[model samples]
Target: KTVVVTTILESPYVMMKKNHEMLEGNERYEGYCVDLAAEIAKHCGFKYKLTIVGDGKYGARDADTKIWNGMVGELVYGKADIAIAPLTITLVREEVIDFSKPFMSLGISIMIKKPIESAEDLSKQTEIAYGTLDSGSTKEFFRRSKIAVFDKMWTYMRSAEPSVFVRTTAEGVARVRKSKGKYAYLLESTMNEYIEQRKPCDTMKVGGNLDSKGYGIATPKGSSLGTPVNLAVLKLSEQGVLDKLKNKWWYDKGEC
Candidate 1:
């Protein structure tokens, strides 16, 4: 059976190529997941097709309806057979799906428009504004946090004037760039680092991680592809393929 893979058009992960409009099928995309999916298919001996997530969301459960949305929902409802992207593995998601061993480890980080001495600096200032990605684990973290510092930060973010919340990392980063040192975006360290290395390198990641986590390939609960995909990822890690791909996309010829 041909595998149906769902992903997002996120940088250094799954991105539409420059001439993507003229391309079709997998050729339309590139980046970490594009390469990783090829490796997985080669190892698993299956044909596959890649499709972008329809809702343009990573995944989140709606508060009132309790329905999963984004890539997670696609898999849960049988819209896609596999998910290969920078999808983070969280306990809530794990309850409804299976995740392969994390191919990349990262933590929540801050992306700022200008250089700040540390996270402490940002926290102390009223001049600068900040927020996490709207629907992912990072936002959820702040929402559920009991830590005094995190709780305090969340309180401000949850009720900030003019609304600091953004629906995507790109939006958050753009806000930072256009805010002229006024906005900061909270995101995965891996992505933050990747963007810091990209063109128009005006953004910088400051201070230590807020939390630690990893990204994994996702499959539906009880899917037979789980173990094979896990093995494929392990093989690639052992062969240093993951590191090579990261360099190829994120660091090689980095304009910053």
Candidate 2:
């Protein structure tokens, strides 16, 4: 049976090829995860098909419904055998699925406005409005209540006038760019840096990420594929293939 792999349709990871309409199947897309998926399949010695998740979300579940959604839903429901994208690993997600170690490294980060410094500074003041993308691991991290700074920031973030939350990452970027230095966005490190190198390049990512995390290779719990997939990534990661792809997709084609 062909392995069914699902990935997000977002930038630098799994986006349509410039002339995607002129192609079919996987030829229609290109990016880090697209390339990364190919290497993984070859090492595991399996045929696979890559499809974008129908819901267009990394993954989220409703506690009341007890039903998984997004890529996580796809796996739990057996719609996709594996999820190969920038899907974050979390405690709740681990309960419903398996992760084959983190193929990509990352952490929560700040986008632009250096005078604001870290989360501590943002937590103490309201002059500059700061927030993260809505319905994501970044927000979940803050809501988990582990640190004083994050706890305070979440309080203000969840209650800011005019609403500090944005439904899309692009909206967050637009908010900062148009806010005229009055706003800042909190997101993961990889994406934070990617935006800094994009056109109209007036934005930057501040150092001192809030915490460390990684995007794990997602698979369904108790599945046999996890063993082979785990070993495949270890060799490729040690061989620096992930590093090369990171440069090839981001810096090599960087607009900045």
Candidate 3:
């Protein structure tokens, strides 16, 4: 029996190869997470299936409708066995699910075409709106908090210029791309580096990373898969396999 591994279609981290239609299951998502998932299964002795999340939204309670998507729903509803995405760990999510010690470390940073002087400049919030990669950790991080530091960040955004809103990180990037320097995006450092190399070359990373955290392989609360997943990641990290995987998908002598 194959372990049904679930994920969402997010670029740089996980995406269907251009030739995915000609392939099947695990062959589809050939990027970092996909490759990393295969490595995890190999080390932990499990066969798996790589399926995209049904809804395109990461698990966030819709401020308006109160809904969730991506792996959070998949796990809660028993739609998948495990999740390996940029899933940020949070207290609310922790109450409902289980996660391994972060396999990858990152922080929240803003992406913009032009550079801002400091964090305070972007700190005030403005018509320059921002968002996270759809159905991702950062989105969940903001949606699941009330009295935390980021909650205050959201408050500032709610009262500032242009207004705070976005359905996906791509939209956030487009806002910056087409804004002629009017908008900005907030995302992980890993992704920010990838975007910095793209053309039109209008994007620049500003402010320090907002929150400190890492991406984890998440499962429904009490699920037994956590230990093996964490151990598998540690084995790979110790052998330089994780670094090799990152370069293969993101930094090797390759084209975007």
Candidate 4:
């Protein structure tokens, strides 16, 4: 049976290829995870099908019922055999799912068109409003943080008069560019940097990362694919293929 791999349609990771309308099957998309998925399948010797996550979310646990959603939920419910995307490996998530060794390293960083010096600047200033990536680890970081700086920033953001939460990175980046230096976005450093190098080139990543994290290939807990997938990832990393893939997707064809 072909392994069903679930992923998100995030840019620089998994996006519709140019002229995708004319393409069929896996040829319809290209990006980091797209390439990574092919490599994993080749090495692990499995036939696979690429599937986009239905809910268009990165996966989060609902506070009320404690049910997982997005790709994670799909795996838990046996909808997909594996997830090959920028899924962060967190302790909470690990309890219910398995993760391959990290294929990429990154952290949460601030995105802005203007030169904001630090997160402290964002916390105290009212002239420029900032927001976190609404449904992912970045948002959860602020929401659950105990650090005084983050706590204060989250409090201010959560209660800001005009509302400071954005639904997606694209929306946040649009707000940053259209707001004319009046807005900043908090997102994964990898994504922030990728956008910075894209067209229009008006935005820049400012301040150091808020926290460190890495993206891993997620699998349903106790699934047999975990070990093979992990080994595949390790082999790729050892050959520097992971770095090559990142460069190919993020920098090799950069517009800005």
- lDDT winner: 4
lDDT of 2 by residue, 1-256 (tens): 9989988888889988889889999899999999989999999888999999988878877879978889999999999999999887788889889998899889888887427777777778789998887777788888897688888898888888888889988899889899988998998889988888788788888768789888889999889999998998899999999889998888888888
Which parts of model 2 have CA positions greater than 4 angstroms off?
Answer: 124-126
Tens digit of per-residue lDDT, candidate 4, span 1-256: 9999999998889999899999999999999999999999999888999999989987878899999999989988899999999998888788888999999999988888844688988887778888886666778889999998899998988888787888877788899899888888888889888998898799998889889998999999889999999999999999999989988888897898
| Full-model lDDT for every candidate | 0.88, 0.87, 0.74, 0.89
Best by TM-score: 2
Which residue runs of candidate 1 sit more than 4 Å off their true CA positions?
63-66, 125-127, 133-136, 155-168
The lDDT-based order of candidates, best leading, equals 4, 1, 2, 3
lDDT digits (tens) for residues 1-256 of candidate 1: 8889999988778877899899888898888889999999999999999999989988988889999999999999999999998888898899888999999989988898754666667667768888887666788889998887788789889889878899877788889899998888888898888889987789988899988898999999889999999999999999999989888888884787
Rank by TM-score, highest first: 2, 4, 1, 3
Model 3: residues with Cα > 4 Å off, grouped in runs: 61-69, 114-117, 121-159, 164-167, 253-256
What lDDT would candidate 3 get against the real structure? 0.74
Per model, how many backbone clashes are there? 0, 0, 7, 0
Each model's Cα RMSD: 2.7, 2.0, 4.2, 2.3
- Superposed by TM-score, candidate 4 places the C-alpha of residue 195 at a distance from the truth, in angstroms, of 1.5
lDDT of 3 by residue, 74-101 (tens): 8887888999887887877777778888
Residue 51, model 4: lDDT of 96
lDDT of residue 40 for candidate 2: 92
Pairs in clash, predicted candidate 4: none
Give the lowest summed-lDDT range of ten residues in model 4.
131-140
